Design an enzyme around this catalytic site. Structure first.
Site, mmCIF file in Angstrom:
data_model
loop_
_atom_site.group_PDB
_atom_site.id
_atom_site.type_symbol
_atom_site.label_atom_id
_atom_site.label_comp_id
_atom_site.label_asym_id
_atom_site.label_seq_id
_atom_site.Cartn_x
_atom_site.Cartn_y
_atom_site.Cartn_z
ATOM 1 N N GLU C 44 15.112 58.323 62.206
ATOM 2 C CA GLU C 44 15.346 58.140 60.792
ATOM 3 C C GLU C 44 14.007 57.835 60.125
ATOM 4 O O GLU C 44 13.436 56.767 60.331
ATOM 5 N N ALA C 72 19.448 60.089 62.877
ATOM 6 C CA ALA C 72 19.510 58.963 63.789
ATOM 7 C C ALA C 72 20.731 59.025 64.678
ATOM 8 O O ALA C 72 20.607 59.150 65.889
ATOM 9 N N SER C 113 17.062 47.915 70.366
ATOM 10 C CA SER C 113 18.274 47.227 69.913
ATOM 11 C C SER C 113 19.521 47.789 70.543
ATOM 12 O O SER C 113 20.263 48.476 69.849
ATOM 13 N N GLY C 117 21.518 54.089 67.936
ATOM 14 C CA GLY C 117 21.411 55.481 68.394
ATOM 15 C C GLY C 117 20.045 55.835 68.936
ATOM 16 O O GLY C 117 19.876 56.005 70.138
ATOM 17 N N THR C 152 27.990 45.387 64.640
ATOM 18 C CA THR C 152 27.915 46.211 63.439
ATOM 19 C C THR C 152 28.580 47.557 63.675
ATOM 20 O O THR C 152 29.508 47.929 62.959
ATOM 21 N N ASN C 179 21.512 38.626 68.458
ATOM 22 C CA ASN C 179 21.442 38.549 67.010
ATOM 23 C C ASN C 179 22.326 37.434 66.394
ATOM 24 O O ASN C 179 21.853 36.621 65.598
ATOM 25 N N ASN C 201 13.928 38.230 62.754
ATOM 26 C CA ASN C 201 12.719 38.885 63.186
ATOM 27 C C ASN C 201 11.511 37.953 63.248
ATOM 28 O O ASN C 201 10.738 38.073 64.179
ATOM 29 N N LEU C 225 1.881 38.973 83.005
ATOM 30 C CA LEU C 225 3.160 39.655 82.819
ATOM 31 C C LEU C 225 3.796 39.919 84.167
ATOM 32 O O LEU C 225 4.986 39.704 84.306
ATOM 33 N N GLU C 227 3.467 38.101 86.713
ATOM 34 C CA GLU C 227 3.979 36.767 87.056
ATOM 35 C C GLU C 227 5.425 36.560 86.674
ATOM 36 O O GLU C 227 6.123 36.001 87.509
#
Ligand SMILES: CC(=O)O[C@H]1C(=O)[C@@]2(C)[C@H]([C@H](OC(=O)c3ccccc3)[C@]3(O)C[C@H](OC(=O)[C@H](O)[C@@H](NC(=O)c4ccccc4)c4ccccc4)C(C)=C1C3(C)C)[C@]1(OC(C)=O)CO[C@@H]1C[C@@H]2O
Ligand SMILES: Nc1nc2c(ncn2[C@@H]2O[C@H](COP(=O)(O)OP(=O)(O)OP(=O)(O)O)[C@@H](O)[C@H]2O)c(=O)[nH]1
Ligand SMILES: Nc1ncnc2c1ncn2[C@@H]1O[C@H](COP(=O)(O)OP(=O)(O)NP(=O)(O)O)[C@@H](O)[C@H]1O
Ligand SMILES: Nc1nc2c(ncn2[C@@H]2O[C@H](COP(=O)(O)OP(=O)(O)O)[C@@H](O)[C@H]2O)c(=O)[nH]1
Ligand SMILES: [Mg+2]
Ligand SMILES: [Mg+2]
Ligand SMILES: [Zn+2]
Lengths: 426, 333, 412
Positions: C44, C72, C113, C117, C152, C179, C201, C225, C227
């Site tokens: 999108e 999307a 997320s 899509g 959603t 969320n 956010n 990382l 670790e």
């Protein structure tokens, strides 16, 4: 992304003048003028409905399909009527007889190729096509017959791009025509099998919602049409705006159609307050969901309280908390667990634009896929049999090159379509 | 009763030999099969081994056809399975081997010929395809013929030409014209992919005569279904016409898979199984839904790429087994 | 040394703009400074366009901003297979062009997320194509899994049972932030019934800063990382720890701010503070990586944790003696100039694998079945190059993730 509207018949035309009357102001487009847009955002996405030629002349990318000159000759001779490129007017100076068969097989069938020609000129415009908007009434020749043909051809040329349909299903109480269920049952038949999103509006569900939810005592047609055009702007064009959570015709389709029939929705606007007084501004948000989810306020005839929902899409457009939105929708889903169907954990499709309807603070279009619309195709399908049994005004159809099996077909199809919709009410 | 599910495999293919991979499904017994990884033992009414020939599929498949035809019960046959898996080698036959369509037509012709006098049949022959969910007559090549319902109900295609078998061989000659007349395009997976489902039906009014005048007629239509093989997005690998064709096949097979689940339970309640979803399932409503008997030949094969295809062929076997049909009479006066 | 990032899906990009904001904000690099180290993917245009129009506009290359003007679609299939396919090559090309330019990297911090899509489907193959092109690295995917009741998309579970099964065999450690269970923190631990998405956010934009930013930064107890996935995953399933932050106090209301270590650490294990509706309803922790930052004495920690190891109502797994990776950084946190975050001089961004997600997965799996049981929106994916296979065979997948997260705990 993009779309190309379609003004089939007179009604779908008359509404076209109101849909474009609105949208243009929702996009700062004066008659032939350009983007006067009070902002700068009403322009980064206009392409959805227009084309670049001059540099001030963004022309609406619609089609005006009608067998009755005087109609498109009233839409073209009035206000915004001088914005459509003349190439858009696909007239049929023939007799626009009120027969579905006269606009689908005999008289409309000729004018079609000179339409498809332009529907391709506009589709092959530029960028990527999304779908086509279709406006019309299921109660006439050029509406239900010719406009249902236009789509049966569109859906063969681009079975990829979507097809929203705005149908003016025959109002119960009084029919503004006589053969009505004939023109109707025959177009719904085509609809269930080509378009994939339908928004059924009822001239009397509007009058109610326009005479009691707007104290408006003289609801002219221009008004009904205006109200309708207010929803179809919150659907499409709206979601072609930014948002914390935006969707688009596909998201709306891919969240709202559990089963491929196409299914028909019932649009509902949010702030529907009478002018002076009622400007209560009780629009925090619980007031919009209060609105949209009531019985009355559904532009459909049927009442949602008479049947579960399969999907809902509150397409909000006005700055709000993704908490007081996503929250409210829940309590609504639990206060009414009764009517909301269960095999969908979250029926509701929250959608959230940012910019609201020009002059308002906060709105939200509602697009309900309730099983309650069963109790309308019932209605239509009844009126059919009660008169089809006696072949009432059938000689106007057969005498136009039709079939006694064609009426049988459509009724049965659209009559089965009632059946199926009950399979989920249970 | 329940439609009989027959599992048919194909000798080891060049692809299978190159994988060197255990057969996907190995039959312990002709009826009993073991599916790969796990410890999977399925049972069927019948199954065929990779050693088991098309001529075993012939005998086994046509015996329930004989039964249903003497009963007057419409025969339906579903070859299911992905591309490559053996639907056409069963149905058409190998090039050398007589196919089930020839052997079942010889079988039908036999059923009428054995008793010409009691049973005077007329054969009409209607070969169609379903391409893009449009129905076209293979024998009359034209635009897709309009779908109608009958007056009562049941969906029929008008204008499907009939022919009567001049001989058995003469049907093969015309039927090979029908087999080329279906849309086909080559694929990586097949030398020739069927782009369409193909449906050889015949209209057999078989007047049994009694007394001076007449007895009852048994009406059978028989049906050979060569489904197109499923493909996938990643299997198609080509957009455009190839994808839209392959996605149109996949939507029709999903519609059929939903119909089978709904028959097993939700139809036992009511109408719900969605006959409407495809053109095939609308005509199949009066064919299977109108009467028994059906048989599904689930073609599988032992390739590793065919694992998803063959496994979901055997998932389809479980779904078609979960379908119980009652036997239903078919009589005209 | 470095860790690329791939912010996929509108949401993975909104969170991305936010995590990316908090960065320069604590590194003294205003609007136009250096160069980022990531990419942005979406089918999108209008959303990645918000990074091309809005703030942080010229801090990116138009080359690390991938878009597919097309569609999307809130469906996995389309976004994985059909459409999202066309873009992947181009996408990869940047995480292979940006992966080359650097000097001995460590991995890619993916931002997606789960129930979207472009966020479900596409990344499913992106992470897919990564586990093969760089199987020799870290694949830490930071997800925003489905709200437990406040989803959603109507289909959400279809999209999130399909991102889990396809990514599972491909990730190294999947961070999770719910969320909705963040909104509770905005209501209960900050007081605001006005939480814009722009705030959740900022919050993940905080916890995440504790992960990469400050930890890849020098300190008294550095934690690479690698670790993480070492000290954090007991088993090869791309195991999904939970993110939690400590000083989530309001920058206006209350002010006890000065909340010595002994307090901020105890404020992590209370379930009302963990960016996840996976309240430790029974889920035994099995490994926690307490990342501290700011003024912290290693004894204060090697004591504030000792007190916790002996609370017992916090029951750790059996087969785990000690499962406490203490990560100490120097530089205190760095709150938004005037958002709503307190601004303390120390914080605890603890993350952990808990047997608790035995729930969250269950409740999200059961969802799926109810609709798949009727095929619901199935014709939307089949018509997009998927099958009865990929659903039913990704359902069976997560089934052995309900058994996995059950067997690795609850038993001794
Ligand atoms: C001073 C002031 O605030 O006036 C308002 C107003 O009084 C009210 C009553 C408006 C008014 O609307 C109507 O009276 C109405 C008339 C016929 C059919 C339907 C409605 C208004 O005319 C409508 C107008 O709507 C808009 O400006 C939106 O952008 C809207 N535009 C149009 O419908 C439109 C009208 C004429 C020409 C071009 C466009 C819109 C809505 C959705 C999607 C796109 C555009 C608004 C806020 C008002 C007035 C001007 C009085 C209301 O309607 C809308 C659609 O907003 C009716 O209930 C709401 C609440 C509003 O507060
Ligand atoms: N924390 C947080 N969650 C978000 C944000 N935006 C969206 N989400 C959540 O992520 C999911 C929404 O995904 P979408 O925006 O629909 O889709 P997408 O993943 O961007 O990809 P498409 O479906 O193809 O548009 C929902 O569960 C939202 O609650 C955000 O900015 N922050
Ligand atoms: N049992 C069999 N014995 C030997 N070879 C076989 C057998 N079945 C199939 N094959 C061969 O495998 C290839 C594919 O068979 P075919 O019957 O065309 O597949 P299909 O399943 O109908 N494919 P498609 O129309 O796209 O569905 C052909 O070359 C066949 O001859
Ligand atoms: N809302 C609405 N309905 C209309 C309008 N014009 C006609 N209708 C409705 O349309 C039906 C009549 O069909 P009509 O539009 O005349 O058909 P056609 O012109 O021959 O295609 C009646 O039910 C009317 O109420 C209009 O401008 N707005
Ligand atoms: Mg074949
Ligand atoms: Mg998006
Ligand atoms: Zn203090």
């Amino acid at each position: 992304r993009e779309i190309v509207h379609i003004q089939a018949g007179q009604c779908g035309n008359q509404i076209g003048a109101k849909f474009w009357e609105v949208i243009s102001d929702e996009h700062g487009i004066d008659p032939t003028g350009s983007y006067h847009g009070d902002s700068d955002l009403q322009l980064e996405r206009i392409n959805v409905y227009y084309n670049e030629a001059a540099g001030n002349k963004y022309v609406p990318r619609a089609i005006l399909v009608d067998l009755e000159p005087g109609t498109m000759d009233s839409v073209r001779s009035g206000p915004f009527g001088q914005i459509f490129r003349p190439d858009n007017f696909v007239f049929g100076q023939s007799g626009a007889g009120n027969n579905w068969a006269k606009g689908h097989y005999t008289e409309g069938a000729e004018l079609v190729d000179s339409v498809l020609d332009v529907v391709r000129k506009e589709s092959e415009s530029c960028d990527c096509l999304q779908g086509f908007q279709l406006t019309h009434s299921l109660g006439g020749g050029t509406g239900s017959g010719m406009g249902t043909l236009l789509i049966s051809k569109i859906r063969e040329e681009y079975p990829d791009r979507i097809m929203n349909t705005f149908s003016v299903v025959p109002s119960p109480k009084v029919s503004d025509t006589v053969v009505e269920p004939y023109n109707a049952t025959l177009s719904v038949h085509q609809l269930v099998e080509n378009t994939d999103e339908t928004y059924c509006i009822d001239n009397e569900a509007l009058y109610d919602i326009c005479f009691r939810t707007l104290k408006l005592t003289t609801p002219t047609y221009g008004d009904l049409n205006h109200l309708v055009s207010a929803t179809m702007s919150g659907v499409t064009t709206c979601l072609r705006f930014p948002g914390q959570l935006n969707a688009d015709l596909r998201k709306l389709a891919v969240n709202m159609v559990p089963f491929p029939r196409l299914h028909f929705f019932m649009p509902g606007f949010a702030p529907l307050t009478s002018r002076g007084s009622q400007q209560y501004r009780a629009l925090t948000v619980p007031e919009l969901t209060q609105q949209m989810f009531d019985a009355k306020n559904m532009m459909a005839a049927c009442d949602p309280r008479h049947g579960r929902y399969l999907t809902v899409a509150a397409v909000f457009r006005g700055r709000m908390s993704m908490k007081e939105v996503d929250e409210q929708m829940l309590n609504v889903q639990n206060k009414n667990s009764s009517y909301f169907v269960e095999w969908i954990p979250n029926n509701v499709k929250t959608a959230v634009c940012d910019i609201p309807p020009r002059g308002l603070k906060m709105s939200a279009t509602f697009i309900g896929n309730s099983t309650a619309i069963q109790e309308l195709f019932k209605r239509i399908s009844e009126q059919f049999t009660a008169m089809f049994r006696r072949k009432a005004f059938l000689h106007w159809y057969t005498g136009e090159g039709m079939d006694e099996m064609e009426f049988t077909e459509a009724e049965s199809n659209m009559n089965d379509l009632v059946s199926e919709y009950q399979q989920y009410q249970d | 009763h329940h439609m009989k599910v027959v599992v048919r495999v194909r000798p080891e293919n060049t692809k299978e030999k190159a994988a060197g991979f255990h057969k996907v499904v190995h039959v312990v017994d002709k009826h009993i099969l073991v599916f790969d990884p796990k410890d999977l033992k399925f049972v069927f009414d019948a199954v065929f081994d990779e050693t088991s020939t098309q001529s075993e599929v012939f005998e086994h498949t046509t015996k329930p056809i004989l039964r249903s035809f003497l009963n007057g019960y419409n025969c339906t046959v579903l070859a299911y399975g992905a591309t490559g898996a053996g639907k056409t080698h069963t149905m058409l036959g190998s090039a050398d081997e007589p196919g089930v369509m020839y052997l079942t037509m010889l079988h039908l012709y036999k059923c009428m010929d054995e008793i010409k006098e009691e049973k005077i049949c007329s054969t009409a022959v209607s070969y169609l395809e379903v391409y893009n969910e449009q129905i076209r007559d293979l024998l009359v090549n034209s635009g897709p013929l309009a779908v109608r319902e009958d007056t009562q109900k049941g969906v029929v295609v008008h204008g499907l030409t009939l022919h009567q078998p001049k001989s058995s061989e003469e049907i093969l000659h015309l039927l090979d014209n029908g087999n080329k007349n279906r849309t086909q395009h080559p694929t990586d997976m097949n030398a020739t992919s069927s782009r369409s489902h193909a449906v050889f039906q015949i209209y057999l009014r078989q007047q049994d005569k009694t007394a001076s005048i007449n007895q009852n007629v048994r009406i059978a239509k028989m049906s050979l279904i060569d489904l197109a093989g499923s493909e996938r997005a990643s299997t198609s690998g080509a957009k455009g016409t190839r994808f839209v064709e392959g996605t149109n096949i996949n939507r029709s097979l999903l519609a059929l898979g939903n119909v089978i689940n709904a028959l097993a339970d939700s139809k036992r309640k009511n109408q719900h199984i969605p006959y409407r979803n495809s053109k095939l399932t609308r005509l199949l409503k009066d064919s299977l839904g109108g009467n028994c008997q059906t048989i599904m030949i689930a073609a599988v094969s032992p390739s590793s790429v065919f694992y998803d295809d063959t496994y979901n062929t055997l998932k389809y076997a479980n779904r078609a087994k979960d379908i119980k049909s009652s036997l239903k009479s078919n009589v005209l006066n | 040394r470095e860790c690329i990032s791939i912010h996929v899906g509108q949401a993975g990009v909104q969170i991305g703009n936010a995590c990316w904001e908090l960065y320069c904000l604590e590194h003294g690099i205003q609007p136009d400074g250096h160069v980022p180290r990531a990419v942005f993917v979406d089918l999108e245009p209008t959303v990645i366009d918000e990074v091309r129009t809005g703030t942080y506009r010229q801090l990116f290359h138009p080359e690390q901003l991938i878009t597919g003007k097309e569609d999307a679609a809130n469906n996995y299939a389309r976004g994985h297979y059909t459409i999202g396919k066309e873009i992947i090559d181009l996408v990869l090309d940047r995480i292979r062009k940006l992966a080359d330019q650097c000097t001995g990297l460590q991995g890619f911090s993916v931002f997606h997320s789960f129930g979207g899509g472009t966020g479900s489907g596409f990344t499913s193959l992106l992470m897919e194509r990564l586990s093969v092109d760089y199987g020799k690295k870290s694949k830490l995917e930071f997800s925003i899994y489905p709200a437990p009741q406040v989803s959603t998309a109507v289909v959400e579970p279809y999209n999130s049972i399909l991102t889990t099964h396809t990514t599972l065999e491909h990730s190294d450690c999947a961070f999770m932030v719910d969320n909705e269970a963040i909104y509770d923190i905005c209501r209960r631990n900050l007081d605001i019934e006005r939480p814009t998405y722009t705030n959740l956010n900022r919050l993940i934009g905080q916890i995440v800063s504790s992960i990469t930013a400050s930890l890849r930064f020098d300190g008294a107890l550095n934690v690479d990382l690698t670790e993480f996935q070492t000290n954090l995953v007991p088993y090869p399933r791309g195991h999904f720890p939970l993110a939690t932050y400590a000083p989530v106090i309001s920058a206006e209301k209350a002010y006890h701010e000065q909340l010595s270590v002994a307090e901020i650490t105890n404020a992590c294990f209370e379930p009302a503070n963990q960016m996840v509706k996976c309240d430790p309803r029974h889920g035994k922790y099995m490994a926690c990586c307490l990342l501290y930052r700011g003024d912290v004495v290693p004894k204060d920690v090697n004591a504030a944790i000792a007190t916790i190891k002996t609370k017992r109502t916090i029951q750790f797994v059996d087969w785990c003696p000690t499962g406490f990776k203490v990560g100490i950084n120097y530089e205190p946190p760095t709150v938004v100039p005037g958002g709503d975050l307190a601004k303390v001089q120390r914080a605890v961004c603890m993350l952990s694998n808990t047997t608790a997600i035995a729930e969250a997965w269950a409740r999200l799996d059961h969802k799926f079945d109810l609709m798949y049981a009727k095929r619901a929106f199935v014709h939307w994916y089949v018509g997009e190059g998927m099958e009865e296979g990929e659903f039913s065979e990704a359902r069976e997948d997560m089934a052995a993730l309900e058994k996995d997260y059950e067997e690795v705990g609850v038993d001794s």
